[PDB]
Amino acid sequence: SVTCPGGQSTSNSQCCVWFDVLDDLQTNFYQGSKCESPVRKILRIVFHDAIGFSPALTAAGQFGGGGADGSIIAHSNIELAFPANGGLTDTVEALRAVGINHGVSFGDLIQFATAVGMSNCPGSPRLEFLTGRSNSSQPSPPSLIPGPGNTVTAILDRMGDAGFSPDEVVDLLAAHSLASQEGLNSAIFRSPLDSTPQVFDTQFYIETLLKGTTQPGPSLGFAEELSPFPGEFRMRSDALLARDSRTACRWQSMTSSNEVMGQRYRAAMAKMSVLGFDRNALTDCSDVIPSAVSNNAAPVIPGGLTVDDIEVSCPSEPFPEIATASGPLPSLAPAP
Numbered sequence: 001s002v003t004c005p006g007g008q009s010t011s012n013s014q015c016c017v018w019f020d021v022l023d024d025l026q027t028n029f030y031q032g033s034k035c036e037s038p039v040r041k042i043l044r045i046v047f048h049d050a051i052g053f054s055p056a057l058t059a060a061g062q063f064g065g066g067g068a069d070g071s072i073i074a075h076s077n078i079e080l081a082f083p084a085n086g087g088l089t090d091t092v093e094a095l096r097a098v099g100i101n102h103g104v105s106f107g108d109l110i111q112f113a114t115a116v117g118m119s120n121c122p123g124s125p126r127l128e129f130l131t132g133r134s135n136s137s138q139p140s141p142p143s144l145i146p147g148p149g150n151t152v153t154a155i156l157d158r159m160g161d162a163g164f165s166p167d168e169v170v171d172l173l174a175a176h177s178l179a180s181q182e183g184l185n186s187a188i189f190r191s192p193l194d195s196t197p198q199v200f201d202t203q204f205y206i207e208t209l210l211k212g213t214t215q216p217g218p219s220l221g222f223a224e225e226l227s228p229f230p231g232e233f234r235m236r237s238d239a240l241l242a243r244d245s246r247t248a249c250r251w252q253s254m255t256s257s258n259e260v261m262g263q264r265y266r267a268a269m270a271k272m273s274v275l276g277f278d279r280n281a282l283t284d285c286s287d288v289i290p291s292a293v294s295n296n297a298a299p300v301i302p303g304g305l306t307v308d309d310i311e312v313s314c315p316s317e318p319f320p321e322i323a324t325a326s327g328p329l330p331s332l333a334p335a336p
């Protein structure tokens with residue numbers, strides 16, 4: 001182990017630079033270690049950056065993309081033109097300057113920012129952080145990012161090609177527990193995807209399974225479905241994934257334990273963090289990531305709804321026993 005200039009101990013000298021980056025991101029990018037829009041955006045970026053990897057394209061004699069190579073920043077001119085990459089400009093620009101001023105690769109920076117961002121959100125696991133990804137990259141081919149109107153088959157197909165099994169697709173989606181939408185229905189800008197957009201918990205999995213009864217906006221936008229209460233937005237792909245036979249059971253098993261959800265997501269994320277790379281070539285700097293405060297709230301079916309309102313879709317196991325909150329129906333405020 002080594003002791004960096006500032007006095008912090010670490011297992012590798014290549015981790016030292018990150019303590020400075022941590023200080024920078026928390027102060028400025030995160031505006032005081034907060035769990036607001038900046039974290040959710042970075043979470044969109046890390047997914048959109050890494051999934052630009054496709055062994056099948058490579059098989060068809062084409063460039064399949066370099067994965068988590070930081071290409072979304074390096075080639076933002078091309079990638080930010082992608083339909084799926086709307087609303088990310090200001091975030092890409094802010095990160096570009098951080099990577100430049102610290103001499104760290106874009107690929108590594110995006111991964112670091114994700115782990116650090118999540119620590120500011122109660123309930124989040126301590127994500128793994130590897131460093132050593134090259135700073136060079138080619139722009140990602142278009143159409144490698146799954147969209148909200150895609151069919152479950154198409155989604156599982158794209159993710160499978162990248163290396164994720166259906167279970168892992170459900171695990172990765174835990175990120176929607178700290179999410180809102182800004183571009184699917186602008187009339188309800190920043191409507192949350194679950195009742196706790198600042199808490200990494202199982203509410204997302206529970207709420208997407210409740211019967212859709214409400215139209216939160218003046219109209220139902222593109223790829224929008226009815227949600228269980230005012231202020232909450234339900235994306236079509238989440239709705240289908242929650243109920244599809246190929247993913248239903250994993251989804252349901254994610255409702256009762258925050259601990260299990262965290263562990264699974266963390267594992268899935270570690271796998272996604274190295275798409276396009278060989279982890280044996282990277283250096284482990286996980287010890288730099290701070291812990292997130294604990295979330296002790298129990299998973300609950302909100303607003304007087306009961307298990308009778310849950311559209312059970314898994315045939316092999318009963319819906320688990322969880323708490324029920326008293327009414328009335330909540331009305332979600334926009335995410336910050």
Ligand code: HEM
Nearest residue numbers: 040041043047146147148172175179180181182183184237
């Ligand atoms: C089946 C794959 C997925 C689809 C189809 C999908 C689609 C979307 C869409 C359309 C939005 C709304 C963006 C907007 O209009 O502002 C969204 C938001 C979000 N997504 Fe995904 N997503 C998927 C997987 C994931 C994964 C794996 C992550 C990252 C680990 C993630 C993280 C986020 C976050 C945090 C937001 C919130 C952004 C914000 O509040 O500004 N999603 N997702």
Ligand SMILES: *[C@@H]1O[C@H](CO)[C@@H](O)[C@H](O)[C@H]1NC(C)=O
Nearest residue numbers: 074099100103104105106135
């Ligand atoms: C990474 O590449 C960009 C150009 O894409 C450059 O401006 C930046 O300084 C490079 N960073 C490092 C750490 O080499």
Ligand SMILES: *[C@@H]1O[C@H](CO)[C@@H](O)[C@H](O)[C@@H]1O
Nearest residue numbers: 230231330331332333334
């Ligand atoms: C529920 O009420 C909230 C405020 O408490 C709104 O944001 C939402 O659109 C709905 O009226």
Ligand SMILES: [Ca+2]
Nearest residue numbers: 049052067071
């Ligand atoms: Ca990429």
Ligand SMILES: [Ca+2]
Nearest residue numbers: 177196199201
């Ligand atoms: Ca949540």
Ligand SMILES: [Mg+2]
Nearest residue numbers: 305306308309
């Ligand atoms: Mg009822």
